[PDB]
Amino acid sequence: SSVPTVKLFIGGKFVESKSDKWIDIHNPATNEVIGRVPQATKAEMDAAIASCKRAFPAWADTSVLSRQQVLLRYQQLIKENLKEIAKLITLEQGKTLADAEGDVFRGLQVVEHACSVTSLMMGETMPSITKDMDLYSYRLPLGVCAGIAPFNFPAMIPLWMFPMAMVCGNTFLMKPSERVPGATMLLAKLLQDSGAPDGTLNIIHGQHEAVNFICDHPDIKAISFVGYNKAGEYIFERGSRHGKRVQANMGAKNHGVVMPDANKENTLNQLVGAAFGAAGQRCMALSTAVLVGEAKKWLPELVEHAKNLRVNAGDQPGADLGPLITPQAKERVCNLIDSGTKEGASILLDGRKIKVKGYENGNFVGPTIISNVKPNMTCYKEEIFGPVLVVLETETLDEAIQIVNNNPYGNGTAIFTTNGATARKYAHLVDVGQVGVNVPIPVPLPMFSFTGSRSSFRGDTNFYGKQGIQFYTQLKTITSQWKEEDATLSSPAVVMPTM
Amino acid sequence: SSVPTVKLFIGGKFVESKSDKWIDIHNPATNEVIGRVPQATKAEMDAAIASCKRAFPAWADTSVLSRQQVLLRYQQLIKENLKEIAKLITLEQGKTLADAEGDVFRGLQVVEHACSVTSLMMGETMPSITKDMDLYSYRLPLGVCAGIAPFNFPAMIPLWMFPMAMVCGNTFLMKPSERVPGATMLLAKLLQDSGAPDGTLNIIHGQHEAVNFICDHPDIKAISFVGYNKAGEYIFERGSRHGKRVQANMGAKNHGVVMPDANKENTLNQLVGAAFGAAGQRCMALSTAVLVGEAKKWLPELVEHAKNLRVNAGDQPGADLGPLITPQAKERVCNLIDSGTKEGASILLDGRKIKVKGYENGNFVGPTIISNVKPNMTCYKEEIFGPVLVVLETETLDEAIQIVNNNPYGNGTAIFTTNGATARKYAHLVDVGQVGVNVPIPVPLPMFSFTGSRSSFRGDTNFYGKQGIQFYTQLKTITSQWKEEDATLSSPAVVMPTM
Amino acid sequence: SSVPTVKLFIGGKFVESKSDKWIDIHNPATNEVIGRVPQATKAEMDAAIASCKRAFPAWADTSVLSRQQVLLRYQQLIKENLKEIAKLITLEQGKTLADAEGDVFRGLQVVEHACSVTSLMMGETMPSITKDMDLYSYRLPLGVCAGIAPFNFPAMIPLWMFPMAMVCGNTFLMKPSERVPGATMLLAKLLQDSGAPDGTLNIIHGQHEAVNFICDHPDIKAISFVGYNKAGEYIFERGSRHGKRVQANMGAKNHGVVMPDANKENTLNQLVGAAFGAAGQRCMALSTAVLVGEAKKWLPELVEHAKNLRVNAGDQPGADLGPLITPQAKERVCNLIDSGTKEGASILLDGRKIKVKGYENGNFVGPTIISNVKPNMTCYKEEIFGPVLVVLETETLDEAIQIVNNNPYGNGTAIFTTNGATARKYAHLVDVGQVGVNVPIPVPLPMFSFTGSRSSFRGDTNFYGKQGIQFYTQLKTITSQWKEEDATLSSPAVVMPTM
Amino acid sequence: SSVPTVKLFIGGKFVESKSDKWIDIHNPATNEVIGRVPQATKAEMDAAIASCKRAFPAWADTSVLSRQQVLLRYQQLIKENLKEIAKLITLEQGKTLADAEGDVFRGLQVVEHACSVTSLMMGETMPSITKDMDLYSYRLPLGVCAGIAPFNFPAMIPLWMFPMAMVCGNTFLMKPSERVPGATMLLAKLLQDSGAPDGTLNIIHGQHEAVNFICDHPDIKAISFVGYNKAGEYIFERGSRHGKRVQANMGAKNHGVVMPDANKENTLNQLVGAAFGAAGQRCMALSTAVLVGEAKKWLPELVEHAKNLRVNAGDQPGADLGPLITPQAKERVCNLIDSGTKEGASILLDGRKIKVKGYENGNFVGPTIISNVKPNMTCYKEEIFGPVLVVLETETLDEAIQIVNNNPYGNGTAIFTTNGATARKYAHLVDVGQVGVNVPIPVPLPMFSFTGSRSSFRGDTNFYGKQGIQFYTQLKTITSQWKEEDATLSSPAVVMPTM
């Protein structure tokens, strides 16, 4: 049977590629080829940005209401077609149907927060600041924008960058991930069906040449990347030279500090469902547990709670976590556990040799809890991105505050306790703004900004709120002085103002 | 006999430095030693940092209603001592008595904005993200802040860094310049005599031995600098490699485009006041005049207007422009003026050899106008920072717009015309942040922010305004999921909180 | 007599009425009977209000998202069904097809603006009132709204009144004009086909008895009216008798002041288009010329631009203007022209006596430029509402400003010039709320409202927009009187609280 | 026998009147003369408006940021001078030492919220919706405003008038009450010492001849008033006739609806502390009361709860009541309650002969709860303005909505129930916006607006809050169409789009 390949979105409809190099998309559950992704040459990637240059004016001159109604209808069109997108997400990423649907549900709250731009991208003006002096502020579209998507989220990250860039008057040159692009094509089909003009969103495929081409054309004003440190700094440096704005969200590693006063069962369940959920392939996991004081006596109970986790494909019911995105991720997460057990870290539960029934040739990795680890091994100083949970054994809360503040990468942190006087102290004494009391994963809901401090977030501005307008638009202040002499046409200006 | 030496402000008292190296502060109008600033030693800077740390907790725990009253009294003490603060800048920098007063006025105007915020404080809550789940945001200080001021404004820029930082719970270690420190020892005494605790503001001196300390000490978390590019980039790098926020404003080379339909008298009076005002030592000065169309016949009248400006010391009533800051600037300006004739220019007015009656030993440079200048010589691609005006001549507006958009040192622009359709197109076809129509000095008001440019600024948040408040504070969201679930103690909660 | 009759919308079905006062509708192009509108009996109005009050509760407890989706579907249907509405408009009123298309486009604009109500149905929220006493405020549906339509616009006023009214959760009564009720039938049909519940929108026909019922029934809380000032103040006092809020924006006669330095062609074309557009039967009509200075010599050219208008019917290719709605308007225009001739004013172009090929029976009045008009005749103080352009002559802009200020009715104006200050000190010296530079019709976008005057606006608020929400709703202020003294099953509220 | 005669505020400094007619003040404690109302005549009454107009341009040109510093310092000045104003209020108004303190505290909260108007006094400058077009709006001050205060709250009411007007750039001429001209004078003295230029606020004194002049003066553009049923409507009529925008909160007799399902340990205390506390004629106090169900059983219980509190002079601690304004008002209230006792309204607790020991000349009144009240009673429907609680004997729940709707003064209610559904259904079909579910007095926030539904109000817009800038400012919208074919003077403009 012919392997159904994906088609680019250059122009106004899906067009077939013309290159020769193909990337094989394997089913994470069965490791079976289910699609081919092209590697379009420089000519097609150039024609895409060219088509972006002939749709920018018609889209920018439109009103904010006309632009936001398209997204208002897009949100409903996606809401009525959530199962179709979730099925592709589960088939091409391995996430459970529940998590696959939750991902698309989270990708709609941004389109909902992108319809209220009419109250933001207007400007300010204050007259009579000086004798016949009046000021006006405006916000103009930047031009053509770009965006790269990682393997983690094939529907969340896509619906984070182009929606606001389009509702602000810009056109997007998107580059989906090289492992699961189907969701992006389905979302582009729904966007075209929602009444959006042609040439707004241009999809291009690739592995490493598209990333270079993105930061090559001087006609690119903004770039958005969610990916992990490795390609974050590279893209930032290569885009800062060409003279473009760059925003990035690198993979983080949140820390969870448990206290004795906290509820044992609830906190243990949250920790075991947040560090091993979705195969740990999330942008904000809880793989770093810190049992403080007496809390380090529930480790056997945590292992028991992690045992009952049903490791199975996302299509089968009753499953919690799925397989990994690629077979190489399994080798990496196995070498990490090997390095851990080499240095003496005791592994309570292991999943390197777990073979689920029905899906043999798969990347299924089970929960792997590690304890007695020091802050000097690769198990703690490296992103795991898998069903791994490292447990620390400190004495007091300050011994945890001093370690959760030195971690290189971090988006937020979690503190499981019931006393408010200590929770507020832990919140005020940390460098991460996304601190959650008894909350496993503090997520940056689209109604509020993101708090990536130093190394988990490159760039300056964000995607939504009052920071996405300041990233896809340019401010323009005009201070105009129109002398009073022209009140009548019988007197010129022979004076000047003061300060 | 002796020269008044500058002393440090460490702990709360004006203590004398114990260093052996000194830098002589001369009178730019007479080139006579009027003071001596010491190079702060390592122990003095360490004690300043310790004093800033000792008073950070008490200053952060204080409410905003008590922090803003200190500055409300400080702005009144400034308005009462304006005639004294304006008399030291003229003696140490050379600005006329009419310009130092305006600088102090613009400084107290920003102090008036650092108090009346009442909205960007700790934060505002927005509940209903999930069932009885809130997203309370808290705005916390950063810690010990730092600031390096240039010779351009010894009373305006200083009133831009610490007034906005100390109000948001933070402390400050202000590092004044090495040529005009006399205007900074009087702005701190009026702050200590205004109800400010001892330890909230420190002052250390030095040329480069203190900048290295400020950038290397891992306790400072915010640095603010204003000056040239060679030092701005160095400070930015040295402060970003350590992991602390750094903002650096750089000089600007504004461009003025004059149309034939403009007001001759008003345009000529506004151009000669923004090119030869304050001896051309300003941040945003109209150093370039692009005469478009038949407006090239106003050059003789422009020269005649630049020949009527009085060049004398600021103390002498009637002078419009003063001398330069240092003797090394007069030679640098004369070299760039001679470079015009070397590269084929036309110096219509020569101000290299001036003789002020009574001050023939100062760095007095008269108004200089250089016409027949192309965008390739050393007079168009260099920050003169002096009384030199380059006059370009074109015939269409599309060429002036291109010349304006073809310079990296330009952050603001100016258009002189009496038409409503010309200024709009000019402001719409140019790439700048601060546009001004018939405004010689389009300086942003305190309510606004100092919007930078590509090369004239490195960062995202400005010094003052709304962004200046966000620069000196950090955000932290606290997801609770701890609500009235046990308000009716009947049984513990064993259900998963879901949306 | 096979002409069809206009049905009602009681309950949701196109039911007929049983009466005998069937008012005939005459075609304005040929004065031929084209339909009969019945005068609803008291029983019909009773059934209509009964259905409205029955549907009010079912429509108030409905999710606003479903209302927005229904409004979006209605907007899409109106976009699709476009030629039918334009044909109905040009057949009932007689305006050109292009004018009807523009009217339907403005209708679609207001509808899509009403769709954007996701961030307007809620109220203000300010926490931290006192000790643990919060308050959550919203907006509730006011009740049974109503609306009367004028003859000037048969599709604009309905789409301005009933969609914004029913988008917040209210039922709406619609009293269509007794001369152009054709468009509202198709509008209500498309709205019902859009998924709206049967019974939310009701349409009652009549001439004067329906307006009395709407102003007498106690269940009709709010009403809306547009048209002359007579009936405006009539219904205003009738509602005040019962305590009803009724916005009665009537109309304004804007004044246009042209300067000698203006673009002759553009200004003289805009004046012709605004003074002889839609047969002069516009709300914000520019039926005045205040040519200042050397603009007097532009009189003849203007006349030529008025003679170049093809006076024809609505469906004739190339027709610019159309016929009048009723013979009463025609005879009033002829009487006003005769009075202007008798008062001394010189009429350059005479449109009173004109004949159209194949349409010599309909009420057809051509352009009439009445020059030499003073602010003391009858043509300057009257409601012409026809192709009449009174041309006042002056020599300075101050006299034009004075003539515009001493005008009883009128809230809009227009200035024409090619300067930057002549169009800046003219909007301030005048006393109006809508000024236009190079724009004859100063009406803003649906986002804003329609400012009015003594004889152009009555009631609480001006018209739709962000204020239309406040108009068709009530403010719900609900406090939070639950404290902590009874949190952990503790003593009741027995302690005395103080401020 | 020369009591201190209070002065007149015109020109900035306190001047004494010269008219032969004078009026004296009386201490409600023992009817002791305090001062003399400086009733003036056309001499200085006309010059006050001229003085306000002198400082009106200076205050309008001043930016909002500099205008709000005066109020920010006045906030602290009030916080300091709390007991100083409380003493004057207690010896002039005749209330307990805590009621004046609260009146000043909430009035201080008013001026605190009035300082946050820097962002809202800008307007809106929309970007280019169509090529070569823009729309910018302004809020400009009208002129010299005025306002009159009743003898209800000498601190609260004034603290809404000048803080909201002057902050918008206008000037105010306040006419405070004739009973307590001691608090407003000290408030204006503290305001002028805050940084207000002498002239931005004037204060006049007199009688009806003064408000008549305020109304008939042609140089006033706004009127803010608070009065009875007669004065409010009279002022509104006289203003609307003179072309004056009037906002007058009229008398309000509110309800105290009680329900059985509520802990009566505090509801009964609030019943007697709302309408009786120091002449509790507040616009939100619980004057009436509808006893339903078991609430009817608490007929003698509230009598004991009222006997718990004691009547005594305001200056003495432990006092809940206070001496009335005048003995004539005492006799008026006594006759009004006698009119009720003679028609069937039984008096359970008599308060007509409450002569507090020591105060035989003062106007002391006590609890006068009237029982057996019928809807058709005179005193139940008319304004009492005195300490009277008319408890209605009913047993209905759905008709209670009707009993509260029949009351024309729908400005205050109470819902003493524990179930939220009952309060919801009550607030659904209620005429008053401020519901009193489990609240002592539903006092809105300074940011909200406190108006009367239909009877206790005469006007369209709101009073204060963010609606503050809707009544003292004019909205000037400008839609400018600056073409692009005129920037280059070598392109004659002859094309114009006609749509």
Each domain of chain C, given as residue ranges in start order, spans 23-250+458-478, 252-429
- Whole-number Cα distances in Å, A468 to A158, A229, A447, A462: 15, 22, 12, 5
If one counts every other C-beta atom within 10 angstroms of the C-beta of residue C320, the result is 20
Give every CB contact of residue D335 below 8 A, 6+ residues apart in sequence. none
Contacts of C444 in chain D (CB under 8 A): 135, 477, 479
Give every CB contact of residue D126 below 8 A, 6+ residues apart in sequence. A122, A123, C445, C447, D134, D135, D136
Across the interface, do A125 and D123 touch by the CB < 8 Å criterion?
A: yes
Contacts of B418 in chain C (CB under 8 A): 419-421
Across the interface, do C451 and D499 touch by the CB < 8 Å criterion?
A: no
- What letter does residue C330 receive in the DSSP assignment? H
- Reduced to 3 states (helix: H, G, I; strand: E, B; else coil), residue C216 is helix
Report how far residue A279's alpha carbon sits from residue A287's, in angstroms, rounded to the nearest whole number: 11
Closest residue by Cα to residue D128 from C412, C427, A138, B420: A138
Structure tokens at A238: 């290569």
Report how far residue D284's alpha carbon sits from residue D292's, in angstroms, rounded to the nearest whole number: 21
Give every CB contact of residue B172 below 8 A, 6+ residues apart in sequence. B52, B144, B145, B146, B147, B161, B162, B165, B166, B200, B201, B202
Across the interface, do D124 and A125 touch by the CB < 8 Å criterion?
A: yes
**H-run or E-run covering C212:** helix C209-216
CA angle A327, A329, A332 (to 5 degrees): 115
Give every CB contact of residue A32 below 8 A, 6+ residues apart in sequence. A26
| Contact assessment for residue D289 and residue D392, using Cβ atoms and an 8 Å cutoff | yes
Closest residue by Cα to residue B40 from B220, B176, B140, B161: B176
Closest residue by Cα to residue D159 from D86, D119, D209, D103: D103
Structure tokens at D219: 């140089």
SS (H, E, C) chain A: CCCCCCCECCCCCCECCCCCCEEEEECCCCCCEEEEEECCCHHHHHHHHHHHHCCHHHHHCCCHHHHHHHHHHHHHHHHCCHHHHHHHHHHHHCCCHHHHHHHHHHCCHHHHHCCCHHHCCCCCEEEEEECCEEEEEEEEECCEEEEECCCCCCCCCHHHHHHHHHHCCCEEEEECCCCCCHHHHHHHHHHHHCCCCCCCEEECCCCCHHHHHHCCCCCCCEEEEECCHHHHHHHHHHHHHHCCEEEEECCCCCEEEECCCCCHHHHHHHHHHHHCHHHHCCCCCCCEEEEEHHHHHCHHHHHHHHHCCCECCCCCCCCCECCCCCHHHHHHHHHHHHHHHHCCCEECCCCCCCCCCCCCCCCCCCCEEEECCCCCCCCCCCCCCCCEEEEEEECCHHHHHCCCCCCCCCCEEEEECCCHHHHHHHHHCCCCCEEEECCCCCCCCCCCCCCCCCCCCCCCCCCCCCCCHHHHEEEEEEEEECCHHHHCCCCCCCCCCCC
Number of residues that make up chain B: 499
- Reduced to 3 states (helix: H, G, I; strand: E, B; else coil), residue B7 is coil
Amino acid letter, A144: V
**H-run or E-run covering B106:** helix B97-115
Q: Which residue in D has a C-alpha nearest to residue B294's C-alpha?
A: D489
Residue with tokens 């719970």: B169
Closest residue by Cα to residue C92 from C234, C214, C187: C187
Strands of B299-428, DSSP E: 346-349, 368-371, 388-393, 412-416
Strands B220-227 and B434-437: unpaired
State the count of interchain CB pairs (< 8 A) between A and C.
65
Residue with tokens 């005599």: B193
Neighbouring subunits of A (3+ Cβ pairs under 8 A):
B, C, D
Residue with tokens 């608020």: C461
- Reduced to 3 states (helix: H, G, I; strand: E, B; else coil), residue B102 is helix
Across the interface, do B446 and D65 touch by the CB < 8 Å criterion?
A: yes
- Reduced to 3 states (helix: H, G, I; strand: E, B; else coil), residue B98 is helix
Closest residue by Cα to residue D224 from D137, D155, D147, D288: D147
Residues of C assigned a catalytic role: 283
Q: Which residue in B has a C-alpha nearest to residue C261's C-alpha?
A: B419
Report how far residue D239's alpha carbon sits from residue D148's, in angstroms, rounded to the nearest whole number: 13
CA angle C287, C291, C295 (to 5 degrees): 135
Which of the following CATH numbers is that of domain C23-250+458-478: 3.30.1370.60, 2.40.50.100, 3.40.605.10, 3.60.21.10? 3.40.605.10
Burial A308-332 (b: 16+ CB within 10 A, else e): ebebbbbbeeebbbbbbbbeebbeb
Closest residue by Cα to residue D312 from D47, D55, D85, D95: D95
Handedness of CA A382, A388, A393, A396 (dihedral sign): positive
SS (H, E, C) chain D: CCCCCCCEECCCCEECCCCCCCEEEEECCCCEEEEEECCCCHHHHHHHHHHHHHHHHHHHHCCHHHHHHHHHHHHHHHHHCHHHHHHHHHHHCCCCHHHHHHHHHHHHHHHHHHCCCCCCCCCEEECCCCCCCEEEEEEEECCEEEEECCCCCCCCCHHHHHHHHHCCCCEEEEECCCCCCCHHHHHHHHHHCCCCCCCCEEECCCCHHHHHHHHHCCCEEEEEEECCHHHHHHHHHHHHHCCCEEEEECCCCCCCCECCCCCHHHHHHHHHHHCCCCCCCCCCCCCEEEECHHHHHCCCHHHHHHHHCCCCCCCCCCCCCCCCCCHHHHHHHHHHHHHHHCCCCCECCCCCCCCCCCCCCCCCCCCCCEEEECCCCHHHHCCCCCCCCEEEECCCCCHHHHHHHHCCCCCCCCEECCCHHHHHHHHHCCCCCECCECCCCCCCCCCCCCCCCCCCCECCCCCCHHHHCCCCEEEEEEEECCCCCCCCCCCCCCCCCCC
Report how far residue B49's alpha carbon sits from residue B43's, in angstroms, rounded to the nearest whole number: 10
Report how far residue D103's alpha carbon sits from residue D180's, in angstroms, rounded to the nearest whole number: 14
Q: Which residue in C has a C-alpha nearest to residue A77's C-alpha?
A: C69
Tell me the residues of C at the B interface, defined by beta carbons under 8 Å apart: 127, 417-421, 423, 437, 487-489
- Reduced to 3 states (helix: H, G, I; strand: E, B; else coil), residue B465 is coil
Report how far residue C204's alpha carbon sits from residue C185's, in angstroms, rounded to the nearest whole number: 11
Neighbouring subunits of B (3+ Cβ pairs under 8 A):
A, C, D
Structure tokens at B348: 């219509």
Closest residue by Cα to residue C150 from C175, C171, C173, C172: C175
CA dihedral A436, A440, A444, A445 (to 10 degrees): -100
CA angle D107, D111, D114 (to 5 degrees): 135
Closest residue by Cα to residue A496 from B262, C223, D258: B262
Handedness of CA C124, C125, C126, C131 (dihedral sign): positive
Q: Which residue in A has a C-alpha nearest to residue B480's C-alpha?
A: A437
Distance from CA of A46 to the nearest CA of D (A): 29
| Contact assessment for residue B206 and residue B175, using Cβ atoms and an 8 Å cutoff | yes
Distance from CA of A376 to the nearest CA of C (A): 46
Distance from CA of A122 to the nearest CA of D (A): 5
Structure tokens at B12: 């709360």
The dotted CATH code for B253-437 is 3.40.309.10
Across the interface, do D487 and B261 touch by the CB < 8 Å criterion?
A: no
Architecture of domain A22-250+458-478: 3-Layer(aba) Sandwich (3.40)
Residue with tokens 């018609």: A58
- Whole-number Cα distances in Å, D455 to A407, C72, C240, D229, D403: 66, 40, 11, 8, 16
The dotted CATH code for A255-437 is 3.40.309.10
Distance from CA of B487 to the nearest CA of C (A): 5
Structure tokens at D45: 């009454």
Give every CB contact of residue A349 below 8 A, 6+ residues apart in sequence. A303, A306, A307, A366, A367, A368, A369
- What letter does residue C220 receive in the DSSP assignment? B
| Contact assessment for residue B279 and residue B381, using Cβ atoms and an 8 Å cutoff | no
Cβ burial, residue D335 (10 Å; 0-12/13-18/19+): exposed
**H-run or E-run covering C145:** strand C144-145
Structure tokens at A131: 């004798």
**Mutate which of B71, B77, B425 to test chain D, going by most D C-beta atoms within 10 A?**
B425
Handedness of CA C104, C108, C113, C114 (dihedral sign): positive
Tell me the residues of A at the C interface, defined by beta carbons under 8 Å apart: 63, 65-66, 68-69, 72-73, 76, 112, 115-116, 118-119, 132, 134, 480, 482-490
Query: Which member of B423, B484, B488 has the closest CB to residue C420?
Result: B423
Contacts of D466 in chain C (CB under 8 A): 124
Cα A320 → chain centroid: 22
Query: Which member of D64, D125, D131 has the closest CB to residue A136?
Result: D125
Looking at domain D264-428, its CATH class is: alpha beta
Asked: is B8-251+456-478 a CATH 3.40.605.10 domain? The reply is yes
Across the interface, do C243 and D454 touch by the CB < 8 Å criterion?
A: yes
Closest residue by Cα to residue B186 from B81, B262, B341: B81
Report how far residue D384's alpha carbon sits from residue D382's, in angstroms, rounded to the nearest whole number: 6
Give every CB contact of residue A497 below 8 A, 6+ residues apart in sequence. A130, A131, A132, A133, A481
What topology is assigned to C252-429 in CATH? Aldehyde Dehydrogenase; Chain A, domain 2 (3.40.309)
* First-to-final CA distance of chain D: 81
**Mutate which of B105, B258, B422, B430 to test chain D, going by most D C-beta atoms within 10 A?**
B422
Across-strand partners of C389? C369
Structure tokens at A130: 């000086």
Across the interface, do C479 and D442 touch by the CB < 8 Å criterion?
A: yes
Structure tokens at B372: 């027949």
Contacts of A125 in chain D (CB under 8 A): 122-125, 136-138
| Contact assessment for residue A272 and residue A302, using Cβ atoms and an 8 Å cutoff | yes
Across the interface, do A435 and B478 touch by the CB < 8 Å criterion?
A: yes
Across the interface, do D116 and B113 touch by the CB < 8 Å criterion?
A: no
Give every CB contact of residue C100 below 8 A, 6+ residues apart in sequence. C85, C86, C87, C89, C90, C155, C314
Report how far residue A27's alpha carbon sits from residue A8's, in angstroms, rounded to the nearest whole number: 21
| Contact assessment for residue D369 and residue D306, using Cβ atoms and an 8 Å cutoff | yes
**Superfamily of domain D8-250+469-478, CATH level 4:** Aldehyde Dehydrogenase; Chain A, domain 1 (3.40.605.10)
**Mutate which of C221, C437, C480, C496 to test chain D, going by most D C-beta atoms within 10 A?**
C437
Give every CB contact of residue B208 below 8 A, 6+ residues apart in sequence. none
Residue with tokens 């091994």: A377
Contacts of D68 in chain B (CB under 8 A): 116
Report how far residue B320's alpha carbon sits from residue B313's, in angstroms, rounded to the nearest whole number: 9
Cβ burial, residue C419 (10 Å; 0-12/13-18/19+): buried
Tell me the residues of C at the A interface, defined by beta carbons under 8 Å apart: 68-69, 72, 109, 112-113, 115-116, 118-119, 259-261, 293, 396-398, 419-422, 424-426, 429, 445-447
Structure tokens at C130: 């006192």
Contacts of B487 in chain C (CB under 8 A): 487-488
Closest residue by Cα to residue C447 from A273, D123, A460: D123
Query: Which member of C68, C421, C447 has the closest CB to residue A483?
Result: C421
